[PDB]
Design a protein around this ligand. Structure first.
Ligand code: FNR
Ligand code: FNR
Ligand code: 536
Ligand code: 536
Ligand code: CA
Lengths: 359, 359
């Protein structure tokens, strides 16, 4: 089974091609993770996945999506992750983390508490920042303040400090969150970036925040550990041909800047889109990026069906298959997949106290 | 769905009829549980089961099955269980524990390390105790030391001490392990008990160790928390009609002695048996015990198929369905069962950070 072939990138070897993508839990308090996360992550790692990327973790307080989001903006926050790293490693999985800034989509309620921007009179809210003072719209109507040059420098340094802290907590894999309409994505998109300074108004200028942040992180992130990013390569906004071409060119510049792997996603930059959700629908898009930018890739959205994951690998569309919601449903999904694909000794995807009895 | 009806027994209410039965993990060191257990139990509790009975936990060091078995024979051992108890409760499940003494089946290898009695050369082994100096045979050839009256008094007191410790650790449900050929089962069975004193040679005498231990525990276990036991009611040894009659009579005596619920199992007292393993095969046996002894029951062995579990409840064969190995495979099995049975808002079997996204 292709799904259960190991993968080596820089000095890291994953025991199979199953990645658990970052999935926000909205259970942290003041950015500090806790027993929710400890058990959540440890149990999924014991489930058999080769790589577990911890949820979007804010580089600064205002870069949380919600009051429940994890953060890594202090040494105390980083220390909270050490036992998560240790539990993921002890299970034989590789610990990664996605570092993030929610930009104009920040200061929102948890998804089961409205999923919408926090109102001005709710004291839990905060002012958001973005390239330009333009709201997302729909359920996120709050207008962000347009970043100053000093804001840009500060946020870049927060990404650097977050990467340093992740490194020192023991993570072996980092992912910069430049997707899903949050701050990085919103610098790249002409929908959200109307700046006329060095950070807007041309392809080079829109790319600048992302490339400068990558370069700054590259200085502190060890060269022998995968340096990755998530990036929305189209929006399904009627501009897909031009947007995909620019996105692939940016991916080439990411490669030139030392990026080891790209997690290929959708922009979600604006609500006025027509995204064709369906099983493995990203597969052909990820393949195009992989081939044209000559970069390893992962993608997601529907690969909880083991045969879809296997097919995508065999077709050389992906190097790793990210499986999210199926692992919320079943933390041992990798074992389920091993069985479904007829892997020999499938139960030994799990640790012995389970594997012995499930043989 | 009958499976998702709450259940009340004494002061304890379970949110559904799914019990996770005790399942040895063989991961403790000198009886002390650790991060293996913490994550294992917390993750299953979050999976939705209403009751989680912690694995056979030895009342004394020589009462472990293996060098990896959990113990509760000191206050330090009991303190180690507190975070397990609390994590189970935090998840909305009820924490229980099975307290145990492996008798002549003690001093064995872990199941994936031979599953057999520890060899004489091997320095991990220990002397076993039993009602009579008779070996189980087959892969468990070690001859145990026959217990004196002073030994019997000591072991009963160890069970009492264990129950007090379990109480103070915060368990809300206790199960005395009088099944599966360990010490309690072996006092009841004429195969293993050849004593000629007050503890063997008649039905009353063979029952005595079990009734005295129950009565002793009842003195320290809170009256408002379920007091339960697991008991093998037949062996499939060609003596089933007589054995089942005696077992059901002892169940009546357990009820008269304050037992709140009986977990009905098989004896496993000797290897010379022919057990007809199959889906839900214990259902009719448990039903007969429930009906004839007029006591609530649970049973196990095959109910990982949600429809089998539901059917057993609707037939009034069981009050709780114990589902073991399916929870090793999938710690969120209770959610899987809710979906399979078409429960409304089935995903809210799980905590919000999962449920929201799975509906
Ligand atoms: C609960 C939850 C939370 C998040 C997500 C999703 C879900 C379900 N996803 C998107 C996720 O990584 C993945 O791309 C999608 O879930 C699609 O893959 P599946 O179809 O679920 O396997 C996500 N994406 C990301 O880049 N960072 C994150 O922190 C989050 N958080
Ligand atoms: C890993 C493991 C460990 C144990 C068990 C089984 C397994 C699989 N079982 C028996 C268990 O409680 C249950 O009766 C059986 O697993 C049958 O139910 P299932 O078919 O697995 O749902 C068990 N029984 C018991 O009374 N105390 C225990 O500690 C153990 N330990
Ligand atoms: N931190 C992120 O990148 C998030 C991505 N989301 C997109 C999504 C859309 C549909 C289904 C799941 C996720 C929402 C949750 C947080
Ligand atoms: N502590 C106990 O009561 C145990 C029960 N077992 C019986 C069993 C037989 C077949 C399959 C699973 C469990 C073996 C493991 C430990
Ligand atoms: Ca504002």
């Amino acid at each position: 089974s292709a799904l259960f072939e190991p993968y080596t990138l820089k000095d890291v070897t994953l025991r199979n091609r199953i990645a658990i993508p970052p999935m926000c839990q909205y259970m942290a308090e003041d950015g500090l993770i806790n027993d929710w996360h400890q058990v959540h992550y440890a149990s999924m790692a014991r489930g058999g996945a080769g790589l577990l990327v911890v949820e979007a973790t804010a580089v600064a307080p205002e870069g949380r999506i919600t009051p429940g989001c994890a953060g890594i903006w202090s040494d105390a926050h980083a220390q909270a992750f050490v036992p998560v790293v240790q539990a993921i490693k002890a299970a034989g999985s590789v610990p990664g983390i996605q570092i993030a800034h929610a930009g104009r989509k920040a200061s929102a309620n948890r998804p089961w508490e409205g999923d919408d921007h926090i109102g001005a009179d709710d004291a839990r809210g905060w002012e958001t920042i973005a390239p330009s003072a333009i709201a997302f719209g729909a359920h996120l109507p709050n207008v962000p303040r347009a970043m100053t040059l000093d804001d840009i420098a500060r946020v870049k340094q927060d990404f650097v400090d977050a990467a340093r802290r992740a490194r020192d907590a023991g993570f072996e894999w980092i992912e910069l969150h430049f997707a899903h309409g949050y701050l990085g994505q919103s610098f790249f998109s002409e929908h959200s970036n109307k700046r006329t300074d060095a950070y807007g108004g041309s392809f080079d200028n829109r790319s600048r925040f992302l490339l400068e942040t990558l370069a700054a992180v590259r200085e502190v992130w060890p060269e022998n550990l995968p340096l990755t990013a998530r990036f929305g390569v189209l929006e399904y906004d009627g501009r897909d041909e031009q947007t995909l071409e620019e996105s692939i060119e940016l991916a080439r510049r990411f490669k030139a800047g030392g990026l080891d792997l790209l997690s290929v996603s959708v922009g979600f930059t604006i609500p006025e889109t027509n995204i064709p959700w369906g099983p493995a629908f990203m597969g052909p898009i990820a393949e195009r990026v992989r081939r044209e930018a000559k970069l390893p890739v992962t993608s997601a959205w529907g690969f909880g069906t083991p045969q879809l994951a296997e097919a995508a690998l065999q077709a050389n569309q992906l190097d790793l298959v990210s499986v999210g919601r199926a692992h919320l449903a079943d933390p041992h999904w990798a074992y389920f997949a091993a069985k479904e694909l007829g892997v020999e000794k499938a139960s030994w995807t799990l640790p012995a106290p389970y594997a012995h009895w499930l043989e």
